Structure 1
Amino acid sequence: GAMAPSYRVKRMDIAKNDEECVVNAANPRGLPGDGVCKAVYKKWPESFKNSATPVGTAKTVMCGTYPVIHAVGPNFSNYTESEGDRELAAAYREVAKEVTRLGVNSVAIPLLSTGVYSGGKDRLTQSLNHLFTAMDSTDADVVIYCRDKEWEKKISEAIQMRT
């Protein structure tokens, strides 16, 4: 585990992360996909061998020795708010289990079920809180990756509030 387990947020490409493993915002089919998923495919294509896994689950595939945790959030275009919220909480719990199993000291993570899977809604607070509920019991340094300046400020604030 990390010496003083922390949360941080960085506004850059998660494919350039400085952590011991990465969470992919995967699709259920293990396809190259778009957004974070496409950057992950371009950086760690080997990790997409038998990566396909259902909604609300996480499946780790090693690129060399570097773990890629394919976390499948619900697409809110397809799910009801109620069922989406449940599968989004589940995907984060499976990430916590895989990060623990791997014994890594740090993990790079995007906010699941945002952008292409948000159903056109701002789910920053929803997704971030399910991230906290899962990862709070873990001892890994968590680094959250986003691309939009207003998202970084809001994520930074939510982290610092609890400190």
Structure 2
Amino acid sequence: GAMAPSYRVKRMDIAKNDEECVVNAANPRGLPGDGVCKAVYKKWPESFKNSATPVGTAKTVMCGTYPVIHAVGPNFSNYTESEGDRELAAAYREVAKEVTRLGVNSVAIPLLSTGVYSGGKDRLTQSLNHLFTAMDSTDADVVIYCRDKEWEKKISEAIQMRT
């Protein structure tokens, strides 16, 4: 575990993370995809061997000794708000299980279902709060990656509020 487990947020490409493992915002079929998923595919393409896994689940594949945790959030274009919310909470709980199993001291994580899976809605708070529900009981240092300046400010504020 980390000496004093923390939450941080960085505005940069998760493919250049400084953590012991990464969470991919994966699709269920293990395809290269776009956004985070495409950056992860370019950096760790070996990790997409048998990475296909259902919505609401996480599947880890090694790239050398570096773990890639393929987390499949729901596409809110396809799910109702109610059912999408259940599956988004589930994917984060499976991430917490994998991070614990691997014994890592840090993890890089994107906000699942906030990009092309958002169904055109702002899901910062929804996705962030499910991340906390899952990861609060783990002792890994969590580093949340985003791309938007206003999102970085809002995520930083949400972290500080709890402290």
Normalising by the smaller structure, the TM-score range is over 0.9
Q: After TM superposition, give the deviation of residue 72 of structure 1 in Å.
A: 0.1
Q: Distance in 2 between matches of 1:115 and 1:143?
A: 18
| CA deviation profile, 1:112-163 (whole Å, cap 9, x unmatched) | 0011000000000000000000000000000000000000000000000000
Aligned twin of 1:111: 111
Aligned twin of 2:142: 142
Query: What RMSD over aligned residues (CA atoms) do the two structures have, in Å?
Result: 0.2
Q: Distance in 2 between matches of 1:114 and 1:27?
A: 13
Unaligned runs of 5+ in 1: none
Secondary structure of the residue aligned to 1:151 is helix
Q: After TM superposition, give the deviation of residue 92 of structure 1 in Å.
A: 0.1
| CA deviation profile, 1:38-62 (whole Å, cap 9, x unmatched) | 0000000000000000000000000
Q: Distance in 1 between matches of 2:155 and 2:135?
A: 15
Q: After TM superposition, give the deviation of residue 5 of structure 1 in Å.
A: 0.1
Q: After TM superposition, give the deviation of residue 14 of structure 1 in Å.
A: 0.0
Q: After TM superposition, give the deviation of residue 100 of structure 1 in Å.
A: 0.0
Q: After TM superposition, give the deviation of residue 94 of structure 1 in Å.
A: 0.0
Give the TM-score taking structure 1 as reference length. 1.00
Q: Distance in 2 between matches of 1:120 and 1:2?
A: 36
Unaligned runs of 5+ in 2: none
Give the TM-score taking structure 2 as reference length. 1.00
Quote the sequence identity (%): 100
Q: Distance in 2 between matches of 1:45 and 1:17?
A: 16
| CA deviation profile, 1:52-98 (whole Å, cap 9, x unmatched) | 00000000000000000000000000000000000000000000000
